[PDB]
Structure formats: C-alpha cells, structure tokens
C-alpha cells in the first residue's frame, strides 16, 4: 500500500523489520532512504539511532532518547564517562519532562517511559561496574539482580521488555569485546549465553521465532560445541520446534541424547538436570506427534528421566526438585 503518508509508512516498515529479526536488511534499507531522501525528520532520525545502537553500527555518527543512548554507548566504548553520565542525565530529564507534559490519565502510556528509564538505569549500573574494573562476584550479583527483576517483569508486555533485553545483549557484547584474555572472559561469556537463552524463552512464549533464532546464532558465534553439549543445544531444539521444524528439532534432541548417554560420566549435576529435561522434552514431543507407539517411547525416555533424576537427588536443590516434579 502506498496511500499511507511516508511520515508513518517508513516508521511502520522499520518497526516491522525490527520485529522480524532483519537487521542488515534494515540497515541497507535505511541507507537507501538516506540516499534517496536528504533531510531527516525527527522520527526517522530517532529510528536511525535506534538501529545504530541496536546493530552496533558504530561507524555511523535536542537529542532523542535513542540518540542519547547511542552516544552513551559510544562514550562507554571510548572509556569516556563524563559525557556518558551527562548524556544519561539529559536523557532522563528529557524523558521525564516529555512524559509529564501530556495529560496522562492512562496507565498503559507509562509503560514505554518506565521501560526507557529502566534501560537507562541498567546502563548506569553497567557504567558504575565498568568504571575501574570487573570482578566475578560483581558480575554474578549484577546478573542475579537482572534475573530477579526480569522475574518481576514476567507479566509485562514483550513490547516493553524487548528493548531491555536488546540493551542487555549489547552491553554483554561490549563487555566481551573489551575484556582481556583471562578467567573473567569465560564468566562473561557464560553470563552472555545465559542472558541469550533467557531471551530465547522470553521471545518464544510471546509467539516469536526470529529473535530466538538470532540469540541462538549469537550463542553459536561465541560458544563452541564439544563432547558435552550444553543447555543451548536444547534451547536451539526448542526454537526449531517452535518454528514448526519438528523433524529437525527431534533429530537434534536425539543426537543430544545419544551424546549424553554415551559420554555422561556424571561430570556435572547441571548436565544431569539438562539430560533429564532433554529426555522429558523428547518424550513429550513423541507423545504429541505420535511417530512411535507409547510402549517404547515411555520406557526409553520417561522412566529413564525419572530414574536419572531420582538416583542423584542427594543435594535436594530447587533446580533439581523442580525438574523432578516436571518429569
């Protein structure tokens, strides 16, 4: 349709591309917009800076919220905190005054402002952590704080949660980029993988399959496969299952089972619990799709997961009891 004015037609196209997982295509399309149209309206300029910071397009050069966020990210990447803090303060003031100038009267309008302020606060916490040095305990307490607040955001909309997850992913990628080779790099990589998998489930529960695939792509970009498969292979199988690729998901999960039952060796309780989860998922998938009679799938997967969980329950951890209950 071309009857829609270009003031909002381009914004709708860009938003659709952002929600469709297309980043390089959006960047090239916006470059073509810059080529064909010289002047920039505030709306498309804001979308340009949003895609610039979201895609880590650092080559591209009052200010809007996305412009301030991109400037703060660049200042953090340049080890400049004075302009980083000034930009965040300006963004907070601009957002507060813009929110309070209107008539309000609607709770739903507060959610975008609260999400933007939360993103600014998280960037402030990251700047404080990255001010002088990074430690494993500080990274762990930051991640657990983020997970606890995301638990508080379970009932929130995905539209109001996606920018938070995107900013967290960008922050973790910056930390990985500017981390010297040591044991801290492995901890940051593990935290990044855990964040990406939680983003995968978060987007999966909202009937979205593009962002989870992008998260799995980043996981495969950083992490590498080995003899002992991690939990992100299982998350990849779940993503492919959500993508209606049942055959591929089943083949991947069966390969994971074949690797685990052949090279388990009781190496890790986390591997034991993800083996139980994989067996339970495989049994449920077989039961739902009915490619085999229940006689063999039940014995092969369900009782196997039950006995695996019950044979090593000497710790009585919550992460083990919930898995046993689910099995």
């Amino acid at each position: 349709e071309t009857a829609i004015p270009s003031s909002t037609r381009q914004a709708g196209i860009i938003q659709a591309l952002q929600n469709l997982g297309l980043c390089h295509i959006l960047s090239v399309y916006l470059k073509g917009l810059d080529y064909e149209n010289k002047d920039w309206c505030p709306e498309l300029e804001e979308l340009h800076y949003q895609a610039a910071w979201r895609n880590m397009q650092w080559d591209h050069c009052g200010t809007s919220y996305h412009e301030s966020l991109y400037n703060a990210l660049q200042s953090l990447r340049d080890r400049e905190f004075s302009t980083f803090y000034e930009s965040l303060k300006y963004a907070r003031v601009k957002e507060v005054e813009e929110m309070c100038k209107r008539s309000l009267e609607s709770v739903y309008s507060l959610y975008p402002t609260l999400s933007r302020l939360q993103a600014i606060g998280e960037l402030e916490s990251i700047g404080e952590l990255f001010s002088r040095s990074v430690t494993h305990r500080q990274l762990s307490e930051v991640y657990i704080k983020w997970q606890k607040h995301s638990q508080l955001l379970k009932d929130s909309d995905f539209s109001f949660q996606e920018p938070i997850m995107a900013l967290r992913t960008v922050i973790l990628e910056i930390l990985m980029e500017k981390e010297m080779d040591n044991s801290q790099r492995e901890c940051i990589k593990d935290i990044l993988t855990k964040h990406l998998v939680e983003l995968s489930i978060l987007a999966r529960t909202f009937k979205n399959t593009q962002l989870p695939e992008r998260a799995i792509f980043q996981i495969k970009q950083y992490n590498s496969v080995s003899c002992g498969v991690s939990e992100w292979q299982l998350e990849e199988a779940q993503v492919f299952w959500a993508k209606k690729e049942q055959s591929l998901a089943l083949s991947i999960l069966k390969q994971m089972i074949k690797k685990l039952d052949a090279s388990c060796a009781a190496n890790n309780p986390s591997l034991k619990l993800t083996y139980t989860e994989c067996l339970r998922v495989c049994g449920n998938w077989l039961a739902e799709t009915c490619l085999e009679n229940p006689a063999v799938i039940m014995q092969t997967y369900l009782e196997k997961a039950v006995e695996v969980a019950g044979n090593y329950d000497g710790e009585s951890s919550d992460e083990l009891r919930n898995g046993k209950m689910k099995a």
């Binding site: 297309l22 792509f217 690729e245 055959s247 591929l248």
Partner: protein
C-alpha cells in the same frame, strides 16, 4: 557416385564461399546427367543443392533467372520420377517471394496429395526431414514454417499431449525440442549461425515450458549406424566402421588439406587386410558407402606434468599433443589406430573422438597394469588440476568426461561384471562427479558418486575382512570434497521433487542445508530471515 558427390559438393562450396554462371552451368549439367543416366543418383545428395540456392534469389538478374530455371527444372521435369517422388515430397517449403507461385503450387500438390496435413503430421514431416539432412542452414525455411504451424495451430497441442500421457517417454513435443537442440549444436560453429539460432529460438519461444513429465534426454540416432554396429561382432570391425564413416563425413568439407589427408587415410586403411576383412563383412548391407569407397580399393614419452595440463586457452594444442604423444609410442598396435596421425594432426574433432579409442587400444595390450597405473595417476592429476580452486575451459572437462563414459562401457578382458568394468582405471569417482557437476552433467555426476560410494563400501568391507555422514566426513578428510554436499547439489539442480530430504534435508543443522530446504519448499518468509541472520 563418389565423383558425382565430390564435384557437386566442391561446386556448392564455391557457391557458398561468396565464375558463378559457369558453376551453375556445371551443376546443371551434372544433375541433368544424373537424372538422365540414373534414377537414384540424386536420391540423397539433392536436399543441400535445393535448399542452398533459395537465398540467392536476392541477387543479380542473371543469378535469379538461373535459380528459377533450375528450380522449375527440378520441380516440374523430374516430378514424375518414382524414385524422386519421395525426395521431392520431403523438402523445405519456399515462402520467400511471391514470384515462386509455380513452385508453391507444385510443391503443395504432392505435399497435400492425401489431404491437408495436421499439426502432428507437420511435426512428423519436420522431424523426418530433420534427420534426413545434416545441414541446419538449409532448414531455415522449415523452421519458419514450423513456427507458423505451431503459432496458428496452438489448439492442437492439447489433445496430442493428452493422448501422449500413456507413453510420456516418447513425447513428440520433447522429441522436437531435443531435435532443435541437436540442430543448434550442429550449427553452433558454422556460417550464418545468427539466423539459424534466432529461428530455433523463436520456434522454442512459440512453446512455453510445458511439463513433459520426463527428466531424461534421449539423443536420437540413425538406425543404419546402430544396426551396423549391432551386426558388427568384432571391436576391430566396429573401430574400422566408425573411423571410415568419420573419414567420409570429414571428406566433404571446403578445406583442401583435410580432404587430402582424408583420402590418403582412405587408401591407407582400404589397402590393409583390416580393410579387406571389413569389406568382406560389409558386403551384404545396403549402404551407398560401398559405392563411395569402391574406387579406393615407450613410457618415457608420456610422463610429463606439463603435457597433461598445458591448458591456458590451448585446448586444441593440448588434445593434439596428447594424440601425437600416444600415437608415436609403442602402445598403439592397430594399423588404423596408427596411420591416422597425418589427418588427426589438422582436425580438432578427430582428436577428441579418437582419444578414448586409442586409450582403450593401448590398455588392451597393457601387461602387469604398467600403462594402467600411469594413465590412472595422470588422469587423477588432471582432475585435481581442474578442481584447483585451474579455471580450465569446459571443452577439456567434457572431453575427459566423454572419454571416461566411453571407457566405462568397455568390457574387461578378464572375467568380471559392470562394476569391474566401471573401474577400468584406478580412479576415485567423487572428483569426476564434482567435475560433471561443474559441467552441468548431473546424471553422470550422480552415477559417479554412487560408484565411488560403492567402491568405498567394498574397500571398508575387505579391510574388515558407514552412514552418509561417515562417508561425507571421510571424503572431506581424504579428498577434501564432501559427498553429502555434492549429492545435495546434484539432487537440487536435477529438479527431482523429493530427493534432497534423503541427503539430510529437513534434518541437518547446517545453514546451507537449511537455506536449500527453505528455497525448495518455497518458504521464502523464513528463507529471507535465515539469509539475513
């Protein structure tokens, strides 16, 4: 015729190279004497003459008058001949100029004697004259009338294919398509190609990409050659027949050097006991070749890495030096396989067509696989050179693929099966399969891949005395080319509906396979996302 055909072809060569009045007078005298003293002298070598002077109407008034005089002589004064009735009935129409009204009416009387030909009858007539003549240039008018017949009678192509559903492998439309393709391949390196290529392209443009429900292309061959090779029970006799036939075909060209070498080779083979035995056997068949030929009655020099691949826009030199190096060595034994040097030195196609024959001749007399090991190593080196990243011209690859195809059909002297026959040389067929993939020869590549997989399975079985992933990783480790990807590419480019899933389609995590499956299933929405991601 022999002298009659030699003089008529020399005269038509002089006419086509543009004394023209003298040449027309001489050809009129020779055809008058042929039709006066004989009834079948012009039964075969007439269609060229007829179809050649038609474009000469747009010339000087003397040329036009002579052209019309000869045409009215041939279509009126010789239309009563019983033997020439079929020849005059089977020739291209002349819709060129209005001044040919007499020719048009006299042509349509015999052509439509039994009634008005339908579309199917027009197709059958076009195919009959297509195989009757080997010169596509003279068939331009036939292509034009075929185009008009298809355009005007588009309604008649529905019930023809409806009745052809029972036997789709003998489709008339696909037979015409391959016939036009063969004619274009014949006229790919001949004068006036821009007109014949346009005509055949327009003829194929008058018919859309109709699903013929067939995947294989069958190249129709004349029954005389097949029956002659069927009744030839000796490989020596078969080699003599194919060589003498090619010599006759290459004896009627405009170049004088090629025909001088051809006639010398004719006397060379016909003067030997092999030629005498050939004529003994050949003396029962009803072929005018008898009348045409009646008056005419070591390892040190082959080991060189540069000799096998001197391929920098030098395909002709490479084949010429290979044939010369093979013939000068002591491996060749047959007189016909030894005395062909002077003629093959100047003919490019002869080296290509005789290289498999000389290879088989040398390998027949090989002892202790002395030639077998050297040839296998050199051929494998050639294929590795082609697979190098080296930008070799496709004529060399298709030449070696033709050699491999011919050698695969040769029976092993020792007891064995077709599986042993396919391993005449010590080669691994995965590289040849990838070469055929680069040459768009998907069927040969798939067959070679199956042969290589069978060889690997047999080798593993005898070593012990093996899934597709295991074979793919083994090939990647040793050869460097993955069999699973090669098979996926073959099964994708071949167009078969459900063949990519067997190699890993829908069950492979690799993005390349996922993209191929997405494009195969027309799932463009997720395909674009995966391409960006």
């Amino acid at each position: 015729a022999f002298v009659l055909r030699d003089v008529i072809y020399t005269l038509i060569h002089y006419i086509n190279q543009r004394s023209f009045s003298l040449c027309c007078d001489l050809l009129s005298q020779v055809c008058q004497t042929a039709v006066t003293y004989c009834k079948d002298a012009l039964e075969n070598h007439l269609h060229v003459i007829v179809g050649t002077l038609i474009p000469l109407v747009y010339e000087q008034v003397e040329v036009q008058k002579q052209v019309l005089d000869l045409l009215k002589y041939l279509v009126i004064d010789n239309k009563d001949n019983e033997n020439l009735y079929i020849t005059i009935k089977l020739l291209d129409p002349f819709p060129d100029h209005v001044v040919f009204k007499d020719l048009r009416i006299t042509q349509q009387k015999i052509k439509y004697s039994r009634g008005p030909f339908s579309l199917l009858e027009e197709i059958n007539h076009f195919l009959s004259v297509s195989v009757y003549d080997a010169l596509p240039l003279t068939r331009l008018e036939g292509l034009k009338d075929l185009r008009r017949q298809l355009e005007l009678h588009k309604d008649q192509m529905v019930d023809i294919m409806r009745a052809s559903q029972d036997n789709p492998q003998d489709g008339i439309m696909v037979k015409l398509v391959v016939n036009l393709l063969q004619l274009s391949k014949m006229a790919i390196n001949h004068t006036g190609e821009k007109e014949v290529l346009e005509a055949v392209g327009s003829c194929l443009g008058e018919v859309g990409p109709i699903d013929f429900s067939t995947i294989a292309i069958q190249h129709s061959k004349d029954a005389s050659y097949t029956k002659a090779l069927k009744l030839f029970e000796d490989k020596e006799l078969q080699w003599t027949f194919i060589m003498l036939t090619y010599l006759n075909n290459t004896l009627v060209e405009d170049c004088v050097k090629v025909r001088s070498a051809a006639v010398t080779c004719l006397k060379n083979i016909l003067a030997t006991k092999t030629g005498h035995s050939f004529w003994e056997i050949y003396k029962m068949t009803t072929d005018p070749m008898l009348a045409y030929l009646q008056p005419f009655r070591p390892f040190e020099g082959l080991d060189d890495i540069n000799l096998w691949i001197p391929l920098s826009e030098n395909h002709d030199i490479w084949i010429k030096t290979l044939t010369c190096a093979f013939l000068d060595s002591g491996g060749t034994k047959c007189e016909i396989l030894q005395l062909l040097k002077p003629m093959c030195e100047v003919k490019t196609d002869f080296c290509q067509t005789v290289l498999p024959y000389l290879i088989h001749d040398i390998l027949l007399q090989d002892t202790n696989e002395s030639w077998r090991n050297l040839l296998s190593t050199h051929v494998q080196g050639f294929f590795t050179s082609c697979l190098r990243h080296c930008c070799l011209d496709k004529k060399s690859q298709r030449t070696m693929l033709a050699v491999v195809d011919y050698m695969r059909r040769q029976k092993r002297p020792s007891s064995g099966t077709i599986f042993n026959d396919a391993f005449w040389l010590d080669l691994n067929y995965l590289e040849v399969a990838k070469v055929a993939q680069s040459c768009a020869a998907h069927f040969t590549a798939l067959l070679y891949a199956e042969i290589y997989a069978d060889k690997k399975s047999m080798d593993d079985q005898e070593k012990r005395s093996t899934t597709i992933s295991s074979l793919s990783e083994k090939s990647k480790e040793e050869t460097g080319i993955s069999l699973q990807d090669l098979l996926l590419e073959i099964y994708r480019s071949i167009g078969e509906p459900d063949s990519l899933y067997g190699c890993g389609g829908g069950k492979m995590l690799q993005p390349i396979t996922r993209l191929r499956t997405y494009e195969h299933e027309a799932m463009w929405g997720k395909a674009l996302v995966t391409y960006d991601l």
